[model samples]
Target: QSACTLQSETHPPLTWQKCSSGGTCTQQTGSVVIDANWRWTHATNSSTNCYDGNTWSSTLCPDNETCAKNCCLDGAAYASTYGVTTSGNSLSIDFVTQSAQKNVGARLYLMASDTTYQEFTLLGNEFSFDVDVSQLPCGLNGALYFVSMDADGGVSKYPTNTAGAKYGTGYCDSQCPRDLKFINGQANVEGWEPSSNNANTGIGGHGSCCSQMDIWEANSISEALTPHPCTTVGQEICEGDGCGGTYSDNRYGGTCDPDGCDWNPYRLGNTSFYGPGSSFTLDTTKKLTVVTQFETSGAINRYYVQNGVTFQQPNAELGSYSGNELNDDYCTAEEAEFGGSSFSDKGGLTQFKKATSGGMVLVMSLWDDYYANMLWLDSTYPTNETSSTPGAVRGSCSTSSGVPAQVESQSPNAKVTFSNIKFGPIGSTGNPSG
Candidate 1:
């Protein structure tokens, strides 16, 4: 088949319409023709042709390794480190505040300090460089933090933990191990040499002052795990210096003498203790009940119920209310009914309204609201309560396979929430209370 060759007029230069979207149109130096016999072949057009002796083209780069280039800011190479780990190979870098800020959408190269100085290119902002070790020798063991690069060219740094921070109380002879975890409701609490036993240091036994500490690591007989804000007292558990009774008193004081403290202990405060921040997780059967009474200030009364066999409960940490605001409308100070005697969902949320009181019990119960019958407890008022009519209790807050349900209730008001909730005269006057 013959090809058609198109010729142009040579009288004057031909003017063409400009390309749309800002594309520049260049003139063709040769004749424009459409050939029917033309066949596409790479080798046919493989000749190195440069019309202006400037630009040239060839096949794309190879498969395994690509070309390396530098993308620098502030006219300096950004610093980086790379290595492999048990999980996998990775890279880390220490970027100054200025360099990180300007590296948005740019490729980053890093060499390892390890035996294999493997090179790597990381796209900015898309990858986060983290060093797991407590300390890194980069920049002469300089404190390491996060460096963020935005696509618009901005770098920033953020460190994980505050460096060089320490806390201590002079009461305990040994350093108090505060980082304790509660496993199965039993605390892996700090061990302590009771100031009570070691009174020679003037720190006294672990009575009044949080004179107690976690001496676990010391591996001594001082194996005691006391709660936070524990009080300090004189040799005797007596009245006066904020203690309700003296060490000499038999009933109130003597009971807590050495091995005589209630399961739940009520502590008096005099601004002489160290408090710790802690979080608690609860385990209960699916399906829980919560009863909250509203007063002029707000809905204050909160009662919780669930499965399990026993009666009586410990008050949750005081004031674990689930209501918002401290007004009267959100709760009431009325002695309302609480708990289920037999344990079921039928009898739940029963209470009476009282006059001239901020005594509202707000019950925030968490059942497996979605699936898997999980249970939860919350409150607006205190956990323990006593009233003319008793409230209802639920046995199951959620449903699992074979696990039994759990239930609890509370009364009174404390700034703390506890594992078990107790009520009635016996409960209110138990170990921690009296």
Candidate 2:
């Protein structure tokens, strides 16, 4: 499907910084656009939905080619419809939105122009941003990451694509999610199946795959930084279970590493280091600054600053594992501790770093998990596994806390705010030696 002229597409303004080595940050007026998956798609020039509630419109989408020609993805009404709003440099996304139709979750990308995605070359750079997750709770994830998506949203590669990056068309990550409405600007209607639990969600025959570098994925109770590398380079269309990730039975059996080398404080044995209370080293009751450095020495380091003092990343105390850095050796050990040998099996840090060489698009989102109920992030994985088992517990959330419908009903007001994004050489953004 392509972009429609029926409704105007306007990007929400967001200002960020490009700092020099001397710590002078110059403001760049960029913008953020919503992912096409969350957009309201319909028949060209008509209000009729091309796909309604996980089911393709039989008349409009009888086949992929016909559907691609007939369907058109519309622009979004940022704040009122999707609960997305920006003030100067800050961007906030709400977990659940209420309108004529209830919208849950959101995913957006930084834009270079009206139809171009902003790409950042992360190697040898220090990326820092201020975030306020106090309003977010367990089961909800506020993510700010980088992915190897086409700057033009596959328009240059796929001849059929007319919507391009202005519509947030080309989106891929380690998950290789099948929920994307279109692949290669073509309708994903062939094997479309309605969701059993959610009326607004579904799975299709095709999925998009790419490398992902998660700078921040967190809530008030816990947080983590991970890099999910892929065997492939750019956005690739995979069919059915061949895509792997959350949609397939064997999650790690795909082109990308679904389970990344996560560095969660709770999982690293610093259980009391981060939480809502004042006792935690970095209290989650207010906004905090996070800085990540991709070293030339081949280590990815992270730190947090709340008050005036900056805190170094906590070291993992699991078994023989020690260092807080994320390197090839650290990834190797975590794969053994956790069960995803895929990180090593498919590219690992070497591939992830290579993927960043060409640069990656910035992605910010807020959503709830349906597969693992977010237990892997804020609770225990494999709920039946005893807590005493190594890597069993990830945070303080109850295993039963993250039910999709439950989180929607319980905490509809959940949201996350990100601001003051700064990128430059290491030490230019914040504390140099943290």
Candidate 3:
């Protein structure tokens, strides 16, 4: 996935299924009103506005603006459209494929805002990269992919506005200087049309300034989110069952979308794994490597998540192994006895943390289960049909293609999981994880 510098924000979905403003009254006999800034605003179609089917002059807005977020204005610099294409093999939303129509410049940008968002900006003439939206999936998959740029140095964290040229909006007073100024999370703001007093750019780009909570309130959580907002981190494992993320700023109205995992975790790994959903069969023959990069100042010892197996063992699966050979098992959470002696007594449901930070790397075998037969083979393991190893990277799905890949290696003393992996500062500069 290629990365470019662009703003991130999504337009809300439409809920004007039933229309009250269907009547064409010249003097405006009635107004069929819908909250213009929230998730359920009206869109005639995925790519058009709700202004159609109504007399433009008499269609009184709940607020007096002709444009709500997502409403079209050719003159505006950016616009986005939503699409769901099941391209036979799998759905693919190419950032580079459809960018030409939006005219949001040469590059595609993506971003999300959380409490710890870094206050920084890209420096220079241009950026490029065709990053599958799934690559760096975010915690909030619902924010709009608002294409943006730090117009000037005053707005971006840079020392000077290299272009020395200022573009639309934020040029005047009271605006985030560095902002392409997409709406702030979920906060709502009111504005008058171009004719009224404070002729703000209503409803679309840089539309509101609400808090994260407010954004959620306006968009309202989707019933589709069965797990609710507080599912423990460990519970969300990788299943490889065809589920990713989504974003719509107008709908959720927050500085967030959905958790990044919902997007693309790619092959066998992204950040963390999803239960059942993450289960996959390993293709040891494939040119794949389980990369584990750790960060610890002292002699911290344990098989990292990238290391494949933790000290955690499953009685039903691993059988009974002596001290060193950990029978690795996992659940949304693990049990005390699972980690065996090292962490068995620590707590309930404790598995190794995923590889984090940078500057470290290890490799692992994608076929060993450390259970059934405890033999170590460096060459690729036999397929499920031929292998003697039990639970050799299998999943609920019948085919190996649908199963998750194994990411661990067996050695004399230590296991190799991650290779060519780096752990450092959060974004190219955070301190390495230790």
Best by lDDT: 2
What TM-score would you give candidate 3 relative to the actual structure? 0.19
**Cα error of candidate 3 at position 368, Å:** 38
User: Of the candidates numbered 1 and 3, which has the greater lDDT value?
Assistant: 3
- Location of the lowest summed lDDT over 10 successive residues in candidate 1: 215-224
Tens-place lDDT per residue, model 2, 1-434, is: 78886667888999888887875778788899999989988998689999888788999998888898999889899998899999999999998899998999899999999889999989899899999999888889999999999999999988687988999999999999998888987888988887788888898888999999899999998898989889996789888998999887668778998887778888878898889979999889889999999987657999989988788898775546677888887888777776668888887888888877777999999999876788888998889876778788889998888899989999999999999998888888862321
TM-score of each: 0.15, 0.97, 0.19
Candidate 3: worst-modelled 10 consecutive residues by lDDT: 217-226
Q: Write the per-residue lDDT of candidate 1 for residues 359-427, one digit (tens) a residue.
A: 111111111111111111111112232222222111111122111111111110101111121122211
Candidate 1 similarity to native, TM-score:
0.15
TM-score of 2: 0.97
Instruction: Give the alpha carbon lDDT tens digit for every residue of 166-284 in model 3.
Output: 11111211111111221221111122222121121232223211101001000000100000111111111111111111112222222211221111111112212222123322122
Best model per TM-score: 2
Clash count list over all predictions: 97, 0, 92
Decide which is better by TM-score, 1 or 3.
Answer: 3
